[PDB]
Every structure is written in structure tokens, then in C-alpha cells.
Amino acid sequence: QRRESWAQSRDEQNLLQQKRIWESPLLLAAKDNDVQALNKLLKYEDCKVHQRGAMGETALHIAALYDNLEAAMVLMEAAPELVFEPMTSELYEGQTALHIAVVNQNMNLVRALLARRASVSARATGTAFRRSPCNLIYFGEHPLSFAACVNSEEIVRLLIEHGADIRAQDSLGNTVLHILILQPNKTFACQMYNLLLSYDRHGDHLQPLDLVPNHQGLTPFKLAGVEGNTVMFQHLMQKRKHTQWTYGPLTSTLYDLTEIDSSGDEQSLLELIITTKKREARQILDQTPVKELVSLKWKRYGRPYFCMLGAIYLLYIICFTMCCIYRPLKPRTNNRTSPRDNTLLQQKLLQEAYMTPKDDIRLVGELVTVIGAIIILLVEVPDIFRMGVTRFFGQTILGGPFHVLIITYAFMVLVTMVMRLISASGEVVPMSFALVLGWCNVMYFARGFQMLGPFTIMIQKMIFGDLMRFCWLMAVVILGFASAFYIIFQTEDPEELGHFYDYPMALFSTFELFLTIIDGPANYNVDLPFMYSITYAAFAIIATLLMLNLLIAMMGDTHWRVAHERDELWRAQIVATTVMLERKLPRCLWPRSGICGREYGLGDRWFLRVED
Amino acid sequence: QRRESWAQSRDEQNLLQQKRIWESPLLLAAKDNDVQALNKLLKYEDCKVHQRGAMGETALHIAALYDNLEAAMVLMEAAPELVFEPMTSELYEGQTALHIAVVNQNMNLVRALLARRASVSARATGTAFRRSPCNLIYFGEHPLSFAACVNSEEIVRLLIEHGADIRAQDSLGNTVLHILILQPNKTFACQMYNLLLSYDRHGDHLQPLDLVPNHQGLTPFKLAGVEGNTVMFQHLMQKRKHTQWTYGPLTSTLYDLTEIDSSGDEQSLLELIITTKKREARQILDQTPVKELVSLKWKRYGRPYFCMLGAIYLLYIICFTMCCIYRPLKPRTNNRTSPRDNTLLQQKLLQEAYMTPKDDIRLVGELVTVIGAIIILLVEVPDIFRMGVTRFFGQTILGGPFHVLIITYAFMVLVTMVMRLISASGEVVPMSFALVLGWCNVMYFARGFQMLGPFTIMIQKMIFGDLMRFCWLMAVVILGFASAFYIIFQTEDPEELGHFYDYPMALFSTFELFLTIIDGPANYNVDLPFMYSITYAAFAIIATLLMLNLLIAMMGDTHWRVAHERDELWRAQIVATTVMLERKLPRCLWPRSGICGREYGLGDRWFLRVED
């Protein structure tokens, strides 16, 4: 409602702009190329040259919009004050006509305005210029930023000659080199990037203008990685690579690897690409400094430390499994209630549970599971206190779904610990969750293997893709037929056919008949009711044939899509593991990657050598 | 038989045409370019120049058919009356030779006929010129219509100079601008469309000739949408769009949206595209006025009103389900007939059914289901009285299959209402239909969701595609093997293996063995008959392996075809919903789309603004 009222207000204000032009002979003669009408209109007063349209625009703005050079020249000669006028409206605050002629690439009217001393530092701070999905252009705020984004190299040279600050930042802190990365035509933005670094002749040289961050802390090199700009990433790596020698077909290149790999506790380029929402960012992982660095970290220190943790976790779940197998049980102390009561054993009290030497061996195994579950909560839960408590930890959970599965496992172990201590009934329900969550967390360590790794991306995309959007159609066919199956057998004896004896069992039986994992109900010794055969024949056609195989056909497409991009998806699993594993392990266990300088006359930087 | 006798009569009349030419020296010398023979033949009388062929043709028609200019000139000089002669035959009534030279594009013979004052208003009303599947050309009735369709711009200019009525309509009411849309070469028809609007210089200007309807009420703009002419639709929208401004790469266009969106109670362009048989018409839904209008109606008012009705219907079916769960049942009053009688409960009488406070809570829930079923019939059934009673409501049912599923649900609720009142046995059969039709109508509201929506197009196309044409082969393999299975066990005791104990159960068991949803019959404690193992091994290979997986392979192709055109099929579901929902809800709930004029100096029209 709010996004649609903003689009409705922008449309009504654009129609009100065209109305106010037609209502006044001044702005209408600026819109058309009526030179003689602007001559005759201006002869009888100052003639309200400071007349505002619906957008806060003047007539000199209107001649700038419609590329009316001869109309705009008359207005500047009559009123030279119109050159310094911004648009006064929230949609276009601060926009002058020097902005408009730059965007329209009117070369003669840019020189005409700067001859009348037009400001090159005027900031278009209106809401039609901000970086938003509502806006189709993000050109920045300054006329040098507008000229760089329309690829007018001759205006970019002409604005810097008149004093345009090349280091100017907008509200987002973006310099002109940041804004060029955010542009759709990426080949032209490479050429404009080179032209604007050529004017950095120690101009406010605290930083060389390709090292200036925005308010997010991103330089143009890091912004090209976060936004998935692979064209600008290859172009900006040419400054960061150094050819050592060329021996025929061979070449030894030395890569800078300073802004790619984390120097201190700042987030590196690898951490930003993993933790971003754009999926074009993960094509930077296939680039010639970055692909070699990821393979180097994994083979040297990533995969040994990951297979050590996978073997410790696999021994831990085997210890948890056996203390659930040997859980303390005794024969039941009450008598059987109904003939449907199948329970023979109940669970011992806490005083009874630890009395034999086999109960003390289990107690050692049970304390390992408790201590291991506390260590999981001491490692993984303090992330929510360091990160955002709700929001920023939420992208960690959308990023890694195995975070919550080992957190939920660790809470289920501590729930059944408390039930052990207070002697509460029903420890089978915390244990059964912890058994299946404990063993299905071993599928986390499948990503140590190129072949096994993206199988869990298939399992994820079949659940939260195919299943989560087709289960709503399945649930409503189950609810329809299970309700029919319930009332058909509601008058019958359940001892012969008891699949639908109460309504929760009729729901569970129809779900199992859907998936064809129990057989169709049949007796052949009694007369089943007449509507059963018609309803189950209709169920067997729509559910077991049609809608079950429809889901299997969907998941076969999900298999095919993930197996196509299989190696690209495994490399993203490796970066996310290596980032996590380097962050949590100390620097003594993780040596820094590449070769450092300072013993080779190269600085304090850390270099990576590729021979190609 | 009737379509084939008409093709047989047209073929015999075309062979009789070539016979009558060869039988007469006049028409044979017109067919060939025998100038000296037509000279010598014409010297001995008037010489029967008014001689009719099999098609009612003259010799001047024959010289026009075979592009014989020098033969046709001799015939006009000898007989000037032959210029005014139409063909006198039902297949070619009214066709003159000015029609024939125009179609053959004989430039010299068109000028030669109009020099002899040939009629440009002659109407070819024969059955070979009407719009029919029997005819390969539909060129209209007038020579200006024939010249526009053969793309002869020089004849079109030359016929208008001699007084051709450009506003002339044929039997279908089609002007020359209507007929150009019905032509296969669409690029040439765009150029001929522009040339014929250029001659509308206030000529009978009640309407500008692109606003003249045919007898179906369609203008050329609406006819391009109904016929799926996307080339002519983009060309005719250029008159209906207005560029407000151009700001560098940006452009603001204002679209007319008058003939696209419904002004009054007339059918709009969106209603005509949904309710038409052609499926090329639904490519108009992806066009730049229409795609933005559909997304605007759905996001503002379509999807809120559709999810309100989906939540009210979902609460209604839950109320219907629980009054079927708690239906009035008592223990049976008679004794058990046979040992196959499994019935324990029967249903209470009407006097017994409402005696407790829990029966009055159900009575409130049962009256909600009755009132809701009457409202479904008061909303949906009066369409058949407003539309066609049989025919035109039939395309509504072929268009929406969820119309009949909620009508059949509403009748099943009122059948079990009457059985409740008269205390009739067997309310389980109207309830079981109403339970599965009630809950599977919740799949109607899946089309509020882009992902869930065209799942029901898959379910439809697998039933009425794959299943309805392969069930005939399955039914005959079931009937063959169930008859064999019946007579094999006809001499056996059914207490051990009773799958085929009578012939309706042998049919039902073999259907379930086909679908592999009951296990294969086996005892292992008795000797089964010898032909069972041979027949069931043959059944398991042809039916469970081969013909079951053959159907699953078909439906996997139906899945792949619908998932390919997935978003194009969901947008057609949204237009059909929005059309239905705007028609039934009052105008106070549905504001009209776009921005109106009259506060912006644009008229009383309603405009839609796209910034691109």
C-alpha cells in the first residue's frame, strides 16, 4: 500500500508537471523551440522568469529537459539568475539545469551554462536520484557523477577543467568510482574508471581515490565483488597483479592479495561475497586471484581441520546414540488400562537409574553428551550477542541452515538432561528429535567432498522449494479424502479395517496412502461400504498416480539444476566453511595465506604467485 | 460428410471450368495469349461475348485470370459491356474482372478497366471469398480490400483516385482496416494500415475509421487483440502512447488505456482475450500497456480481495468438515445379516438427531454450510440466465473448470440437506462427494501465488490430456486380466485368496494391482492354481512395469511443458481472476485503474504512466 501510494504520487506529480507547462506561455515556449515567442513574452516585465512548475522547475530547466538550446540561450540572457536555480520539490531537490544538460549530453548547453558560472558542486539530493528500486537510474548527486554514468567523456573532461571535485561523495558516501560500478553498461564503465583515475594527481592524497570507502566501508574494489561486477573485478585486478617473467608460453604473475584476504579483524572480500544477498557475487569465486586462494586455503588447512571436526562429531553422535540405546527402563508398575495399551516397560526413576556398574559406564557417556552440547552452545550462540540479536543473525540462519540444526540438537540434549534430573516422563520425545537431528548433522560434513557436497543443496532446494510450495495442494487433497474415508467407515467395525478409526488416524493413513507406503485397505472377508471403492479409486488416480509423480517430476528438475552448477556450488560451500573456520580457530593454527614481502623487497603485503 | 461433399463439389466445378474453356474457341483464346485468334473469332457476329463458363465467367474474366493483357484489350474493344459483368455462380458471386486484375496485380489491366469505367464498389459475395476454413484467402468483398491484402500500394492509391469507398464494409462488417489484421503477412499489413489511415480526411467522420466496429463490435484495435496479432497490436499502440519527457536514458510514456480497460459495461480488451478460443491472443498480455495494467490491478485490489475470499472459503470448509465428522449416528437396530456384514452404527432419525446441546452447536454449523451453499448458487448459477443458457455458458465451463466443482459441491450440500429432512439413508454418498469437492476447491486459490498457481494447470493437463487418452488402453488391459484372474480363482476357496471373489472385486483388485497399491495375491499355505502365476507374471510386466511407467513418462512431459511456460500461464490466471472479480464486486470496492484526466488537461480518459 505504501509502495503503491508512492508510485501513485509520482505519477500524479508527473502529470501535474505537464499541466503547468501548458497553463503558462513561458514554460510552453521553453518546452517547444519557440524562440520568437520567448522573445515576445520577455519584453513586458521581468515577466516572472522565477516561475515554478510542479517539480520546482524553472523555464531554463524546461529548455534543458527538452534539448532546446536556442530557447535556453534566450532565458539565460534575460535572466542570468536562472542558472543558479535548483528544483524545489522532494522528488528532485537540488537539481539544476547543469544536471539536466549533462544527462541529456547537450554539449553546447553545458558550455553555455559554465560560461554563466554554473556550479559544478550542486547536489541533486531528490528522491528520484537515490539508490532505490523505485528509481531506474542511480547517477549520484554531482554533475561529474551524472556525466560519468551517461558515458560522456568530453563533458567529464570539461567539468574537471571548471573545478569539479573528483573526490565528492553523495549521501551514501559513494565517490564517482563507486557509482560507475553500480551501472548496467559495464564495458563503458571500465573506460570511464580509467579516465577518472588519470585525474588523481595527488589531489587530497590521503587515499588514492580507489581506496576511499563509502559509508559501508567498501572501496571500489570491494564494491565490485559485493555487487557481482565481474567485468570491473577483472579490470581492477590489473592494478593488483605484477608479471615477474615470461618464458615463452609461460608467465609468472604475482597477485597483491591484500584487499582480497583479511589483514586484521576487518571483513575481507571472501567474507563479503558469502554474506551478501546477490548471487552474481559468487562469480568472483572463479577469478584468477580468488580461485587459487580458495583452493590453497582448503587443501592446506581447511580440509584437514574440517575432517578432524567431522571425525570428532561422528564419535560424539555414536556416544550419544549408545546412551540412548541403553537408557534406564524397568517393567511397568501399573496394570494395563485398555486392550489398546501396548506399553510393557516404563522408565526408571533417577535413584534407580544409576545403581549398577553398567549404569556408571553410561553415566560417563551421558556426561560427554551434556558437555558436548554445552560446548555447541558456548561456540555458536554467542554469535547472536556479537552480531545483531535478531536481524543480522537471521541472515546467518538463512545462510547456514545447519547452524540451527546443531543448536536445536544441543537444546534437545539439555531438555532430556533436565527431564533426567527431575524424573519427568517422556524423555523419548526430546531424544527422538536429538537422534535424528544429531545424525542428520553429519550431512554438514559432506561438503568436505567435491562429489558429496552439493547433495545437501539438492535436499535443501527440494524441501524449501518443491515441497514447501506443493505441500499445500497435497494437504488439501489429503484433508478432502481423509474426511471422506473417515465418514465412510464411521459406521463400520474397526476390527476388520481400522485405517480410519478416528480422525487423526484417517489423516495419517491417507498421507501414507498418498505416498504409497502402506497398502490400500482391504479385507475381502467382509463387505466394505460402497463409497469406499469409488473414493479410493478416485484417490488412487489423483494422489498416488498424478500428484505424487508430479512432485517427483519437480524434484527431478531441482536435481538437474543443482547438478548443472555443481562445482560452482561446492566452491561456495568451501569459502563459507573456510571463512567460518579461520574466524573461530586461532592464528597459530591458521597460517596466513600467500608469501609475505619484507624478505623480498615487496613491502609488508602478502602475495600469491600464479604460473600460467 | 457435409464438409467433404462441399470440397467434392468445389473440385468438380473447378474441373468443369477447365472443360468449358477447352470446349469453346473464344474462352480458349482468352486463356492462351492468342491475339490473332481472338481477332479472327470476333469478326463474324457479336460472337457470343456474353458467354458463361462453369463459374459464371466471361472471356474477359478468363483473360484476367491468366494475366493475358493483349487478349483482354481485344475483348473490351469488341465488347465494352464485359467490364461490368460479374461472375454468376454461388462460389464466385459478384466477382468482376476488376477484382481479378487487382489480385493478380496486373497494373496495366487495372488502368485499362478503370478507363472503361469499371466499378470500384463491386462486391464479391461468393462463398470462395468469405472468412471460412474452407477458403485459404479472406480478402473481403471490395477491390480496395483485395488490393490491400495483396500488398499493392500503387493499386490502392489508384483505386482511391477513382472513388473507392475506404469505409466500405463486407458481410461481416469488416472495413479494410479489419481485414488487414486477418492477414498472414503481418509486417506488410502494418504498412498498408498506415497508408489507408492517411486517406481519412474527415471522410464520413462520425468515427475515424480505426474506431468503426464490425458486427461483433470490434474495432481494429480490439480485433488485433482477439486474433493474437501482436505485430499489429504494437503498431496500433503507437497512436495510443504519448511520451512526456526523455531524461537521458529515461523516458516517461503515458498510455491511453481507454479501449484496453473497461469504461462501462462493455467487454474490454482483457475480457475478450481471456474468453477467446485462440491462444495467440494471450501474448497480448505481455505487452507494455497491458502487462503493467494487469500487475497493477492484481497487486492493488486483486490479490487482497482474492485472499479474503480464500480465507473465508477455507473457514467455511472447516465448518463443513466438522459437521460431517460429528454427524448423527446411533447403534444399529437390526441384527447382523451375514458374516460379511461389518456395519455397527446407523444414522439417527431427524427427531433423534437434535436433542442435546452438542446437537445444537452442530445445527449452527450445519446452517452455515446450507446458507453458504445457497449463496454459491445465487452468485454462480444466474450467469446461465444472463449468458447463453447452453452454448455461451459452455465456454465458461471449458474456460473455468472450478466453476462446476463449486456448483457440484453446492448441490451435494443441498442433496444431503434434503436427505437430512426426509430421513433418507445414505447421506455418506452426498457427503463424501462434498468433502472431496469442497477441499479440492481450495486449489482454486492457489492461483493467488506465482509459484503455486500453474500447478493446477499441470493437474488439469495430466487428467484431460495424458489420463483421458491413455485410460482406454489401461481399461482394456484391466478388463482382460481381471476376467482371467476371475475365472482362475472361480473354482477356489475365497477365504485364503479373496481378491477376485466376484467380478466387480476382480476389476477393482486388478486396477489396484495395476497401480501397485495393493500387494500381489499370495498365500504360500495353499496351492494356488497354475495359471495364476503365468497370468500374474504377464500382468506384472505389461501393466506394472510397462504401461504404468509409460503413463508416468507422459505426465513428466506435461510437467515439463507447463513449467516451461509457467509465468505466461500464471498471468493468464490473474487476468481471468481480475476480470471475474471486478465484474462481481461493486465499483466502490474496485477503483478504476490508472490516472484520469480532467485535472491535468487530458480529457475524460484514464491514463497509465510507464517510466522506462
Ligand SMILES: CCCCCCCC/C=C\CCCCCCCC(=O)O[C@@H](COC(=O)CCCCCCCCCCCCCCC)COP(=O)([O-])OCC[N+](C)(C)C
Ligand atoms: C565408524 C566406526 C567408529 C567406531 C564406532 C563403534 C561402533 C560400535 C560401538 C560399540 C559396540 C556396540 C555395543 C557392544 C555390546 C555391549 C557393550 C556393553 O558392554 O554395554 C554395556 C553398557 O554400555 C553402555 O552403557 C554404553 C553407553 C555409553 C557409551 C559411551 C562410553 C563412554 C566413553 C566416552 C567416549 C568419548 C566419545 C568421543 C567424543 C568425541 C551393557 O551392554 P549389555 O547389557 O550387555 O547389552 C546386551 C546386548 N545384547 C542384547 C545384544 C546381548
Ligand SMILES: CCCCCCCC/C=C\CCCCCCCC(=O)O[C@@H](COC(=O)CCCCCCCCCCCCCCC)COP(=O)([O-])OCC[N+](C)(C)C
Ligand atoms: C529414558 C529413561 C530415563 C529415565 C530417568 C528419569 C525419568 C523417570 C520419570 C517418570 C517415570 C514414569 C514412566 C514414564 C515412561 C515413559 C513416558 C511416556 O512416554 O509415556 C507416558 C506418558 O508420559 C508422557 O509421555 C508425557 C508427555 C511428554 C512431555 C514431554 C514434552 C517434550 C518438550 C520438549 C521437546 C519439544 C519438542 C518440540 C520440537 C518442535 C506413559 O503414559 P502412556 O504411555 O500413554 O500409557 C498409555 C499407553 N497407550 C497410549 C499405549 C495406551
Ligand SMILES: CCCCCCCC/C=C\CCCCCCCC(=O)O[C@@H](COC(=O)CCCCCCCCCCCCCCC)COP(=O)([O-])OCC[N+](C)(C)C
Ligand atoms: C528452565 C528449566 C525448566 C524448569 C526446571 C524445573 C521444572 C519444574 C517442574 C516440575 C518439577 C516437579 C517434579 C515432578 C516430576 C516431573 C513433573 C512435571 O511437572 O514435569 C513437567 C516438565 O517436563 C518438561 O517438559 C521439562 C522441560 C521444560 C523446560 C525445558 C528444560 C530447559 C533446558 C534448556 C533448553 C531450552 C530449549 C528448548 C528447545 C527444545 C512435564 O510433565 P510430563 O513431561 O508430562 O511428565 C510427568 C512426570 N511424572 C508422571 C513422573 C509425574
Ligand SMILES: CCCCCCCC/C=C\CCCCCCCC(=O)O[C@@H](COC(=O)CCCCCCCCCCCCCCC)COP(=O)([O-])OCC[N+](C)(C)C
Ligand atoms: C525441532 C525441529 C527441527 C528444527 C527446526 C526445523 C527448521 C528448518 C531448518 C532450518 C531452517 C533455516 C532457514 C530455512 C532454510 C533456508 C531455505 C531458504 O533459503 O529459503 C527458502 C524459502 O524459505 C522458507 O521456506 C522459510 C522456511 C519455512 C519454515 C521453516 C520450517 C520448515 C520445516 C522443516 C521440515 C521440512 C519437512 C521435511 C520432513 C519433516 C527458499 O528456498 P531455497 O532452499 O533457497 O531454494 C529452493 C527454491 N528453488 C527450488 C527454486 C531453487
Ligand SMILES: CCCCCCCC/C=C\CCCCCCCC(=O)O[C@@H](COC(=O)CCCCCCCCCCCCCCC)COP(=O)([O-])OCC[N+](C)(C)C
Ligand atoms: C502443509 C501442512 C498442512 C497440514 C495438513 C493436515 C493438517 C493436520 C495437522 C494436525 C491434525 C492432528 C491434530 C491431533 C489432535 C486431535 C484433534 C483432531 O484433529 O481430531 C478431532 C476432530 O477435529 C477435527 O476434525 C479438526 C479438523 C477439521 C478440518 C481442519 C483442518 C485443519 C487444516 C486447515 C488448513 C488447511 C491448509 C491447506 C491449504 C489452505 C477429534 O477427532 P476424533 O478422535 O475422531 O473425535 C471425533 C468424535 N466423534 C466420534 C463424535 C465424531
Ligand SMILES: CCCCCCCC/C=C\CCCCCCCC(=O)O[C@@H](COC(=O)CCCCCCCCCCCCCCC)COP(=O)([O-])OCC[N+](C)(C)C
Ligand atoms: C487454518 C486453521 C484455522 C482454524 C481451524 C480450526 C481447526 C480445529 C477446529 C476445531 C477443534 C477440533 C474439535 C475440538 C474437539 C471437540 C469440540 C466440541 O466440543 O465438539 C462438540 C460438538 O461440536 C460440533 O458439533 C461441531 C460441529 C459444527 C462446527 C461449527 C460451529 C458453528 C460456528 C460457525 C462458524 C462460522 C464458520 C465461518 C464461515 C465463513 C462435540 O465434541 P465431542 O463429542 O466431545 O468429541 C469427542 C472427541 N474425542 C473422541 C477425541 C474425545
Ligand SMILES: CCCCCCCC/C=C\CCCCCCCC(=O)O[C@@H](COC(=O)CCCCCCCCCCCCCCC)COP(=O)([O-])OCC[N+](C)(C)C
Ligand atoms: C449422516 C447422519 C444424519 C441422519 C439424519 C436422518 C437420516 C435417517 C435415515 C435413515 C436411518 C436408517 C439407517 C441408515 C444408515 C446409513 C445408510 C447406508 O449407507 O447403508 C444403508 C443402505 O442405505 C443406502 O445406502 C441407500 C442408498 C444411497 C442412496 C443415495 C443416492 C445419492 C443421490 C445423490 C448423489 C448423486 C451422486 C452422483 C455424482 C456423480 C444400510 O444398508 P447396508 O449398509 O448395506 O447393510 C448391509 C451392510 N453390508 C453391505 C456391510 C452387508
Ligand SMILES: CCCCCCCC/C=C\CCCCCCCC(=O)O[C@@H](COC(=O)CCCCCCCCCCCCCCC)COP(=O)([O-])OCC[N+](C)(C)C
Ligand atoms: C426435488 C427434491 C426431492 C423431492 C423431495 C421429497 C422426496 C420424496 C421421496 C420420499 C419421501 C418419503 C419419506 C421416507 C424416507 C425416505 C425414503 C425415500 O424414498 O428416499 C429416496 C429419496 O432419496 C434421495 O435420493 C433424495 C435425493 C433426490 C433429489 C435430490 C434433492 C434435490 C436438492 C437440489 C439439488 C439437485 C442437484 C443434484 C446434484 C447432486 C431414496 O431412498 P434411499 O436413499 O435408498 O433411503 C431409504 C430411507 N429409508 C430406509 C429410511 C426408508
Ligand SMILES: CCCCCCCC/C=C\CCCCCCCC(=O)O[C@@H](COC(=O)CCCCCCCCCCCCCCC)COP(=O)([O-])OCC[N+](C)(C)C
Ligand atoms: C460429481 C463428480 C464431480 C463433478 C463432475 C466432474 C467433471 C470434471 C470437472 C470439470 C469439467 C469441466 C470441463 C472439462 C475440463 C476442461 C479440459 C479441457 O480444456 O478440454 C480437454 C478435453 O476435454 C475433455 O476431456 C472433456 C471432459 C471429459 C468428460 C468430463 C468428465 C471427466 C471426469 C473427471 C474425473 C477425472 C478422473 C480423475 C480421478 C477421479 C483438453 O485437455 P486440456 O486440459 O485443455 O489440456 C490437456 C491436453 N494437453 C496435455 C495436450 C496439453
Ligand SMILES: CCCCCCCC/C=C\CCCCCCCC(=O)O[C@@H](COC(=O)CCCCCCCCCCCCCCC)COP(=O)([O-])OCC[N+](C)(C)C
Ligand atoms: C475408461 C473407463 C472404462 C471402464 C473400465 C472398467 C469398466 C467397469 C465399470 C463398472 C463395472 C461395475 C458394475 C457394478 C455392478 C455389478 C455388475 C457387474 O459388472 O458384474 C456382473 C457380471 O457382469 C459382467 O460381467 C459385465 C462385464 C462384462 C464385460 C463388459 C465391460 C464393460 C466395459 C466395456 C467397454 C470397454 C472400454 C475400453 C475401450 C473400448 C455380476 O458379477 P458377479 O457378482 O460375479 O455374478 C456372477 C454370477 N456367477 C457367479 C454365476 C458367475
Ligand SMILES: CC(C)CCC[C@@H](C)[C@H]1CC[C@H]2[C@@H]3CC=C4C[C@@H](OC(=O)CCC(=O)O)CC[C@]4(C)[C@H]3CC[C@]12C
Ligand atoms: C566432550 C567432548 C568430547 C564433546 C565434543 C563435542 C564436539 C563434537 C562439538 C563441540 C563444538 C562443535 C562444533 C560447534 C560449531 C560448529 C559450526 C557448525 O557450522 C555450521 O553448521 C555452519 C552452517 C552452514 O554453513 O550451513 C558446524 C558444526 C561445528 C563445527 C560443531 C561440530 C561439533 C563440535 C566440534
Ligand SMILES: CC(C)CCC[C@@H](C)[C@H]1CC[C@H]2[C@@H]3CC=C4C[C@@H](OC(=O)CCC(=O)O)CC[C@]4(C)[C@H]3CC[C@]12C
Ligand atoms: C523426530 C522427527 C519428527 C524430526 C524431524 C527431522 C527433520 C525436521 C529434519 C531431518 C532431516 C533434516 C534436513 C537434513 C538436511 C538438510 C539440508 C540442509 O541444506 C543445506 O544447508 C545445504 C546448503 C549448503 O550446504 O550450503 C538444510 C537443512 C535440511 C533440509 C534439514 C532440515 C531438517 C530436517 C528435515
Ligand SMILES: CC(C)CCC[C@@H](C)[C@H]1CC[C@H]2[C@@H]3CC=C4C[C@@H](OC(=O)CCC(=O)O)CC[C@]4(C)[C@H]3CC[C@]12C
Ligand atoms: C454463511 C456464510 C458465511 C457462508 C460463506 C460462503 C462463502 C465461503 C462462499 C459464498 C459465495 C462463494 C463464491 C461464489 C463464487 C466464486 C467464483 C468462483 O470462480 C471460479 O471458480 C472460477 C473458475 C475458474 O476460473 O477456473 C471461485 C469461488 C467463489 C469466489 C466462491 C468462494 C466462496 C464463497 C465466497
Ligand SMILES: [Ca+2]
Ligand atoms: Ca505392501
